[model samples]
Target: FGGRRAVPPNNSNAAEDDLPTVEEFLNVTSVHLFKERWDTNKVDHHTDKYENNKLIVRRGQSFYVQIDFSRPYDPRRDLFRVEYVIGRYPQENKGTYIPVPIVSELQSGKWGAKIVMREDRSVRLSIQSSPKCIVGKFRMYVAVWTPYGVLRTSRNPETDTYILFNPWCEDDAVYLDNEKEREEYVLNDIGVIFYGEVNDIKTRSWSYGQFEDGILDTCLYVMDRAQMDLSGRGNPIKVSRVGSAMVNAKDDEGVLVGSWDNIYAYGVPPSAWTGSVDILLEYRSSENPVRYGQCWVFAGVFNTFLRCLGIPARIVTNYFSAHDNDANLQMDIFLEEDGNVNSKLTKDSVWNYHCWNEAWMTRPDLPVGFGGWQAVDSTPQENSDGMYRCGPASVQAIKHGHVCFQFDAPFVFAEVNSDLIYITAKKDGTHVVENVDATHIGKLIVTKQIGGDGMMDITDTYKFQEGQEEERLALETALMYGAKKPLNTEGVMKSRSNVDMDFEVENAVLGKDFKLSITFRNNSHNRYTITAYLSANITFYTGVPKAEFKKETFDVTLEPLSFKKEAVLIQAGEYMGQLLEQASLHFFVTARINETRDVLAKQKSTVLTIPEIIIKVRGTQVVGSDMTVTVEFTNPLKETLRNVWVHLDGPGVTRPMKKMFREIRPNSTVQWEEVCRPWVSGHRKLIASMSSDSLRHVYGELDVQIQR
Candidate 1:
């Protein structure tokens, strides 16, 4: 009968009589959230294995709750207001404080609470949160009013709910309609990452271990490191942007510290890491950055971080991948007369195989069809936001020449499409442009195949066919985005040197004998004299030459239609002691036809393989049960192996087990036993990698069937 508004009772005793009467018309005694039901909900949300001791669910879903009160309530007559608030200072207009009103029914895509039962004092609600609600922990508060006054209750921290990305809901931005793909990309914790040269592709099993303990908290901590506010966490694009930035420790003490060389006195070698779990868990507990990681390692850990947040992600390996500095989108390799790479003038580097990540999401801020797989790198290549972050840059934008799009589209574009510029440092002290190969870079871009271990080429998704109209258009836009200049395609072609030459290498194993050969043929109908300088360097697979292992200079006397060939023998004693971790030989040749002052330049990045480690599962494998895995390897060299060890890692199989030996005898087979306990059920694969101070990169995998 008053003004229909309720105010708090006056504090002073003198004004107590003037305050409106307060009644318990609709008071809440306790709340009964369906936590047991959330256990099932977590399974549906794919947030299982976390067991965070509370309700953890994805958005665009419904959950049930029951509230108790002692007063009669009619939906038509009484007023009930419910709200879910995020952040300490919640604001209603910001969507941090959301009000839920009683509704007659719950729809599939709407946000509201539908009453299941109104039993006078007890009410059961089926509450639905919208698919796009801010992903965060939110507390629910309720207030009710009758003719007498309003009832109030404090926010309960124990019953706070966490909302995540919903790859399960079609309406959600991060949704993946294919259930099998969703399982493979979003649910699978173990994955295979590809590295090495594209032709001699190598696979390493990486335990993303996203669902492992403390990883969720660690991932959330990355967002805090990214300076992302509670409201901005709702956008997957922003989430991925911050995620890429925080994966490396170069700028923000984020995750893994990157080290290119073999030195790791401060921590373990990048080659020593088999999975992301150890790095992530260690960083979270110590609050100190993990020691070191390379491109592949960085990509794997970033995938783990995104997957932990319910976003689908995978690792991609780009062959002849250019690390373009100065935003010029060109990888310049300056070669000396003896065919050795001149480090002074060369700034940009082209890796044999560089690995990065692609995250699946929708770009609400960008134009339509620009959503989906986005290229994001966490390798601390260049600074974005003045820190080590990269892109949630659209893959479609990259292919369609949208270089001006948000995030780092241009940098990623250059990775897959940059021209490989070959420059020659002549004896005259001048640099000459000898060749430009646009098709060489991004020659083969691939990811591990879904539902299998084979490779799936995603190259065309990132770039059009080389020199095509779309690619040219893309290139035009790319250069407009501040690349130094349009590539000088006309400066160097096969026209630069009419004489043809080829270089070949015997595919030799480590600690074995091999041969390097080069040939020249004069196709022109004229007598031509040519001088060729060749240099072979023992180098890291990243194309960084360590030492000039061998140098050969030859003078070719070619008549019309003449051909000549020469071979250089290589033995174990020549390079055995000089090779580095993940070592390879970079063969470079600067051939010049003296008549025309013409130079034909070519360099080959040769990656050699070794004997594989033998992994055999000898004991039974049951869920939560222990089994034996035996790894047998042989030292093929006369020298004994020191600091030798075997590491076994897998999901649903083993939890990063290792066996170290003091020394392995020369050219003799050695065996180590690993007891593996399976934590999950179903078919799984266990990866075994063997390395020593002597040998590096011996890897093998075995498919194991675990009984439930």
Candidate 2:
């Protein structure tokens, strides 16, 4: 019953109650409405007309109809427009231009009404306020790309193709479904696949569509990993959503059973499937014949029924290049640079590809459904709706090395070539590679070596969507090449640069001499000769040395498959002593390629300095008996000196002399100790030594004979 309009008198059974004519349903505002529209149009109906202010929607959720329009309407000057925004904002649109394209079209409805849509799968209908390019604004009408209660397929890219059905393509003039949801593109056009975060990987909820930094947990919920034969070797994957409904149901599963089952295959029960059914499904063939007006009747009929049942569905137009001559599918849009090479193509030994669906229901009553109702009975049994289930979460996946997460088992089109892709890096068992579609290279497979620890192998597979041929796939494989190309250097080393140091030291000395030796290796791709030179610079002084031989010169061949190195030591004191006051060590290097000695590059590393040196000097006082002195050296280079020893030594014998230490700096010299008069004075020799590390040499020894 319409809210304000009287119910149609054709009511019959409960099934009839489940299905309503176009006049009963109301246009309740929904999430599908674009955000901006919320501010402009508060109500779902056009403001121009109203019999009783009653909003009506068809039982089959197909399209939104604006009835009771203003009179004197011309297609070119009078119009309305509808708008909708898909995908969560802030996340999808906030940072980048990740576009989802939707296609649309306009059609004639029964009694002055009309249907507008973009593509067959997902679409939005906007009423052009002015028709045929007339200047005017427009309002948006909403409809789903749903198929009627009919199913259709074709072996050709036109009305039908056996495989690779074009979901974005549409077959015109089919009866309409009122309750089906349609796909609308936000970017270029439909069928442009891309990678994006569904639920925030962190929150694990669709409420947050942003990408998650943490690990992903929302998977297909595999129940029997063993049954999948995943071999514990697969990719790490994240799926946006997964579900099954009547749309993905097969033929044997209730109303889905096509007509071929009637004569040769299993026919439906007399009670369930009436032999006089209007739908006729072609079993082995890809196309269904329902209202055989030159289209697949069954798919069309099913699509109509879906709309009638308030379901959003679309009958994708299958395009099999083998079945027909179509320029889009058969010819490779991508080509190889070299003419000698026949570009790689989809090389499937089999006849053709396959068709599927991107079904979504905002009916608020239907569960989310995926996959298409192309009715392939060979697949495993589906649940009640005849849709395949991912099974219980118990599906045990035995992971060998690092199992890369992948949403689904990658399906490579047969015509693509392997060389079209290349690997950039390998780490943690996953290879970072890019899909180069320029030369028919659709994906790069990083192999996973079974039984081995996580390593980059050839098992990882990648796929590229149309438009972008340079997208990279996070591939998990086991094949690894040797080390990354050696610290590559060009022509002669430059005059300046910095180097990352890798070495271990013990009790290093300040202003001491140290040497570092480094080597380089080359592979086939990169190999060039180089002459090594060593140079130093003090930040405090920033001096450029002019020592000729200080730099090493030699003729060395940088073999493509070999390695080379040199050992050279430059005194740190040369630079450290001059700039020892600061906390920095600055040095430079010059490398030349071969005799021409083109500057390869230069590098620098800091070397710090420590405190000053200490020294001990000893001398005897004139008036003194037998004496032995001790000295303590403090800041021998700059600070006060202390604990100095002074000994009295004669030609025949020796005796301990007085000893004392004192503080001293390079700026001043003071006597550390002194002695008084002695009773008996004789000739004596004075000697002194400083207690310090092996870095310095200042042993004081002298002769001074005294007699009284």
Candidate 3:
């Protein structure tokens, strides 16, 4: 007899005999979620950046999900609902806990779910998230009403969902409707970042592997590092601004440690990075900021982080970008006027080229039309709110001279539209404003184009055309808005004297000797005498003086209305033995007219270029399979290249890999092959970069489409 108590009642009707007794009333069984949606395209998310076998959907869109029950459920009688929540404390006001209403039909621009398919034991519902919803790993479950209040299904990380920004959704703040632009900004995995001096602007392939596996987690980690709240994740404004600060490790020890020092000990060189994934991954795994990143590196990483979070972003380069340290819209530098100057201005210098990011999103925080592309700089520069972080300043606001606007508009406005004032102290108490180069800053603003591999000139979008009255208005706005006003130039003499000078250099390539011409002319009828101090140095592209390799003094007398031209030749050995950051050779000529007591100053830079690596692939790429890529390039130098290094990174590769060599003979060709296995299928780019004693910034790429 089993138990005396059980035997007495008889296992007859109370428990179960041949037939089972059941009191089932809307009971929940295990939930069902089909991984078929991981195909992603069906849900209209541009790319999938999740870990293996995860389902991610974007906000303001409808996606299908299935929930299994104890038995066939009746929608009319079953009292149950699905709850969506994120973060530790899910507050309704913060959009942390969302109760998705079950409706008869899917409604436009609403958060709800409708039963699409009902089987014997399972029910499929189409869920729609409102345009503005918390973005992160979310907990979703079905709560069924039973005799015991409400019973919810078990929660599993495998079944949790990630919701991101939907640029395709018109209701989303980051909505971008242009098909080609959406593909390029939201889906393109590769783009070119322009750098170097204005005369010798160089382009390199920057791999933004935003859609690669676990890359999204790294991006989310960046936000997590910034202490950004769960509600802020849905807004690109907060995400971009906070993410901008997160990219530079200067303040929070967030991601990449920006360095301008020559010695890159214990870390990779700033110019050595070819992609963002490696930098971001190391930060996540090592729990420390990756060492040695500059403007371009931070810009590249910022683009990756934002794009990974579904915000449309692009890298932008402003040739001759001005760093306005004092909120004054002017960059002042000294070349000296004959024994006349006393006070010195701060080193408010203009960079040869500065790189930053542009993200597309609506600005509900500002007036209308301020939306579209917002300028965001990640480089550790001037402080913003005491931290070394810069904008989400609207490009439109910067163009219209709205420097008083939010998020470092004045700092960014000065970068593009500010004046470069040259101060020459006078014999009098005041220092005269010698020359104002209004068109010097914000030259050739460009980015990767949508339809072609070429760069699209976006200068007009950031600023009005040079010499236009609107340009001056944009400049005047900076002065009006609490910017340190530039010196008054009233009745001050500028340096267009009778004696004029020009320092010129011809275009040169890597590994070749170069020549420079310094010409001076006396336009006055009076006989002219002058003393010219000529100097040449290898400086950083940012105009920071490094090594003074050559110096000369020329004393010459010319007849009335005559010209004198001097030529100097620099051997390849001269600069090759020197430290080269960007192959930028800076030359300066400062002269004082002996008879007229006037001053003449001129400077020019001679920069060189190198060969580019060639990338080629001959086989089809399939997901979860291996693909071979070939990289080759020729050495242009006559001497053997030493300490050569080549690196490759992209989506297909499991990790970023490289090759190092002690030497490659002069005029020799280097062809190497690399193996990669793609984990996720889609269009992706394989990027290769090279560095050698002979040259640097050598890069190549190949675009391959992968299939299932």
After TM-score superposition, what is the CA distance of residue 63 in candidate 2 from its true location, in Å?
Answer: 16
TM-score of 2: 0.19
TM-scores of all predicted structures: 0.88, 0.19, 0.88
CA deviation > 4 Å runs, candidate 1: 1-40, 49-52, 66-83, 107-110, 117-124, 140-158, 335-344, 383-387, 426-429, 486-497, 557-565, 668-670, 691-694
Model 3 spans with C-alpha error above 4 angstroms: 1-24, 30-34, 37-43, 48-52, 337-348, 425-432, 495-503, 518-533, 553-566, 590-600, 614-626, 632-644, 662-671, 678-684, 691-696, 703-708
> Considering every candidate listed, which one attains the maximal lDDT?
1
RMSD, one per candidate, in order = 6.4, 36.2, 8.8
Off by over 4 Å in 2: 1-252, 258-277, 280-353, 360-708
Clash number for candidate 2: 169
Which candidate would rank higher by lDDT, 1 or 2? Answer: 1
Q: Give candidate 3's root-mean-square deviation (CA, Å).
A: 8.8
lDDT of 2: 0.24
Q: Quantify all predictions' global Cα lDDT against the true fold.
A: 0.75, 0.24, 0.74
